[PDB]
Each structure stands twice: as structure tokens, then as C-alpha cells.
Design a protein around this ligand. Structure first.
Ligand code: 1MU
Length: 358
């Protein structure tokens, strides 16, 4: 813990927790590739259990970074191609709006307006097929971006089909185990519940509810230590010894589409470094309920750029998470909290910390 990191982290996060009334928080800073950990407050207010480096937080849409990397690993295995039609992996999807919609479009939210959430009514595999068959795109494929769990969720499910494995087993064996993320879970096992923080929403304790495509879109829980290790793996994929996983991480940071100053990867989003802080700060707003934005295709996709701000926000009803890193500077941050507080306050704190260290 060098005093400078200690000082910028406490100087930034202390007022963040006060203003946002966050019950519990863990932060990791990766600096010159080494992790430094900080924690505050309570994993479980009622039971007086503190946040520790072993506390599990719900990552919410940060889970989409794992789905994009797992998809990247399947491409690198030669199991799928992003240029494949969706129907190649789900031939029961016969409705003609699907002609021309590829795995790329599903992975990058550019299928033509798939909705943010899969309806609660949708449970069984037959419900899911009915839902997609009935879905009417607002736009031609590859023209507009509309962030959507029903889009990347479906990408994650289709992407593991040729493997033979369930999504969870594919994720454990191909991503969590090789990276030694041994306290990262799609389903929290009973032995681990003692570490699982409660989320707080309007001051009620809550955990994420089951739903269709939950594992694929928002269902991972992890510790600050594992998430530091996730950032390290994404900062420096060349250190990873599993050839397809290395390549997969690299593919998830390729630049597929541009809107404004942002580039869409698989799960990750990226901006050129140095970034305008107001551009990433205002650019995070899950207070715009639906922003549909025109995309320009990057033909062909640019390979992972080292001078990028690579990041992802994520929330559940009770949790707020943020991950950001700059490959060229070997520098990153993870912030995990058990309240869903506004995204601009996350990116502002993250930028203030990494700016000061850069
Ligand atoms: O009980 C469920 O199945 C459930 C749980 C959490 C959520 C919110 C999870 N966050 S998210 O992936 O759906 C999302 C959506 C818009 S922003 C965002 C995020 O995670 O930042 C949705 C449904």
C-alpha cells in the first residue's frame, strides 16, 4: 500500500460513500500490474458482518465481460464465428426477421432493437423461443445499438452450444478455473453464503432474482480479489497460458462498432486514452432507460488497442459495480458496492483515482 494510492483512494471513496450512503464497498486498484485492496462498511447490516476481501458482490452487467470473453474463447476454439447467422445455432428460430441477424449483432446489441430485459413471463426453453420468434425489430440489423440483456444473453447461450457444455460449466472450466477465479460464481454454493453480501435497495436487503438468461447477462457474483485478478487478466492477456482464452480476451476488446466516442467490444466498451473524463462520466447513464444510438461499423474490427480506457458498469437491484483499466499503463480499478448508486458517480471516482496514478 504506497501512500499515494492510499491517499487518492481514501480521499475519493470516503466522500463517495457519504454522499451516496453506500452500506459496504470494496475497491481494488491495479498499479504497475500489482493489486491493492480497500474495504469499508457492511456486507450485512443486520448481522453486523463487515466487507472483507472475501465478500461476494453481485456484479450485475459486469457479468457481460465474462460472457464476451467466453464467446471470444469459443471463436478462438473454432466453435462459432461472429459472422455466423443466429439460426445456425438455433434452427428453430424460423421467423424471417432473423435472416441477416448474426452472432456479432447479438454480442454487440446491434440486432435491431432487442429489448433491454427478457420479460418476467419467459421461463422455459419453449417460452424463450416464442419470445424471439415474436420479437419485431425496429431497425435493420447492424444499424443501431440498444443495450440489451436479451441480445448478449442470447449470444452467451448460443455461443456455448457447440461445446456441449451448459453455460455455467463452460464458464467454470474455460474462464474461471484457468484464471484461478475460485470465489466467482454464477450460483453461490451453500458453503459460500457466509461471504455473500446483501444488496440494499431503499434500505431493504435483497439479492438478484432468477430470470431467463440471467447467468449470461447479469448473474455473476465475485470477490474483490477475483475481480482484481479478472482486471489483471484483461490488462495483459499475453500472460495467460491457455491459447484460446488469451485470444478470446483479445477478441472481447476488439472494436466492432463506434457510437460517439465509444467503441463496442464483446461485453467490454472502450474509448481512446487519454479520454475526456466528461465523455466517459456523462457517457455512463442508466438513467436514460433506453438510448438507441446509430452505430458505424468498424470494417474490419480494430484489434485491442493498448491506449484505451476499457470499462464496464453493472448493477442489480441491490448492487452497483464498475471496472475500468488502461492496458498501456498497466493500471486498473474495480469498485464493488452493495447499493445501486448512479453510474456517473462511479466513473467520476474511478477517473479521479486512475488520473491521479497515471
Ligand atoms: O431478477 C432478475 O432476473 C433481474 C435482476 C437484476 C436485473 C438488473 C441487472 N442489471 S442489468 O444487467 O439488467 C442492467 C440493465 C440496464 S443497466 C444494467 C446494469 O447491470 O448496469 C434485472 C433482472
Amino acid at each position: 500500500a504506497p501512500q499515494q494510492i492510499n491517499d487518492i483512494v481514501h480521499r475519493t471513496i470516503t466522500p463517495l460513500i457519504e454522499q451516496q450512503k453506500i452500506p459496504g464497498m470494496a475497491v481494488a486498484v491495479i498499479y504497475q500490474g500489482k493489486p491493492y485492496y480497500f474495504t469499508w462498511g457492511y456486507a450485512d447490516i443486520a448481522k453486523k458482518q463487515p466487507v472483507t476481501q472475501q465478500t461476494l458482490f453481485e456484479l450485475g452487467s459486469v457479468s457481460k465481460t465474462f460472457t464476451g470473453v467466453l464467446g471470444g474463447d469459443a471463436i478462438a476454439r473454432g466453435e462459432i464465428k461472429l459472422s455466423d447467422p443466429t439460426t445456425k445455432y438455433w434452427p428453430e428460430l424460423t421467423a424471417k426477421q432473423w435472416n441477416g441477424i448474426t452472432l456479432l449483432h447479438l454480442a454487440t446489441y446491434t440486432a435491431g432493437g432487442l429489448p433491454l430485459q427478457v420479460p418476467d413471463e419467459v421461463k422455459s426453453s419453449s417460452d424463450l423461443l416464442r419470445f424471439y420468434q415474436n420479437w419485431q425489430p425496429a431497425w435493420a440489423p447492424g444499424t443501431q445499438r440498444l443495450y440489451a440483456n436479451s441480445s448478449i444473453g442470447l449470444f452467451g447461450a448460443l455461443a456455448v452450444k457447440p461445446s456441449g457444455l451448459s453455460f455455467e460449466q463452460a464458464m467454470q472450466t474455460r474462464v474461471f478455473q484457468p484464471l484461478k477465479l475460485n470465489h466467482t460464481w454464477i450460483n453461490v454454493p451453500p458453503a459460500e453464503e457466509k461471504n455473500y453480501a446483501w444488496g440494499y435497495r431503499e434500505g431493504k436487503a435483497v439479492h438478484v432474482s432468477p430470470g431467463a438468461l440471467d447467468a449470461e447477462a447479469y448473474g455473476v457474483k465475485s470477490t474483490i480479489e477475483d475481480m482484481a485478478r479478472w482486471v489483471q487478466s484483461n490488462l495483459k492477456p499475453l500472460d495467460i497460458n491457455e491459447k484460446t482464452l488469451q485470444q478470446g480476451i483479445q477478441l472481447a476488446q476488439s472494436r466492432y462498432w463506434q457510437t460517439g466516442d465509444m467503441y463496442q467490444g464483446l461485453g467490454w466498451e472502450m474509448l481512446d486514452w487519454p479520454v475526456n473524463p466528461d465523455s466517459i462520466i456523462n457517457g455512463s447513464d442508466n438513467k436514460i432507460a433506453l438510448a438507441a444510438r446509430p452505430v458505424k461499423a468498424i470494417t474490419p474490427p480494430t484489434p485491442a488497442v493498448r491506449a484505451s480506457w476499457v470499462h464496464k458498469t453493472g448493477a442489480t437491484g441491490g448492487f452497483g459495480s464498475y471496472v475500468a483499466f488502461i492496458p498501456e499503463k498497466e493500471l486498473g480499478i474495480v469498485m464493488l458496492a452493495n447499493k445501486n448508486y448512479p453510474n456517473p458517480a462511479r466513473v467520476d471516482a474511478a477517473w479521479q483515482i486512475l488520473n491521479a496514478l497515471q
